[PDB]
Symmetry: C2
Subunit: 96 residues, 2 copies
């Protein structure tokens, strides 16, 4: 459904932490140290159905600084169970 | 560095066409046929000096359907000259 830019407050930073933690479990970029999530941060709201406002979940697209390098991460969250998954983690990328 | 999501009106579509035209000149992605720019479309305002008012130009991050595949393209536009450049182009990427 809809997209919006969100600020980089505690909630967002904690999404970055989730992303680094999970990537660290995967191990493709070594041992990473979360530094910071930077602007911009995009949120997509995913609705359960056309015609209705029930929210199925969200996707977040982040730029996350870890171990002095900048990466892109995409994170899904289920509205109901609050489960999050790391959909993509890529970099180093150039600064936005 | 300041961001906003913009709609995919004729202006934006024309940016898509420019991206495909330019990529076609470059030839690193084959011979492409522009179809459509889809949501979401992010516009960055680029200031001459960060924290200060004067606008140097803009950057547009697009999702562009060409030849039935989806690519990511970033386009800069200079505020004073209106010159545009294709900063990058890649894909195929999964739908946002």
């Amino acid at each position: 459904g809809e997209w919006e830019i969100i600020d980089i407050g505690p909630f967002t930073q904690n999404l970055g932490k989730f992303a680094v933690d999970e990537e660290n479990k995967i191990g493709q970029y070594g041992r990473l140290t979360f530094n910071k999530v930077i602007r911009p941060c995009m949120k997509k709201t995913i609705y359960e159905n056309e015609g209705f406002r029930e929210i199925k979940g969200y996707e977040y697209q982040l730029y996350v600084r870890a171990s002095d390098k900048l990466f892109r991460a995409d994170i899904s969250e289920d509205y109901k169970t609050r489960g999050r998954k790391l959909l993509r983690f890529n970099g180093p990328v150039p600064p936005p």
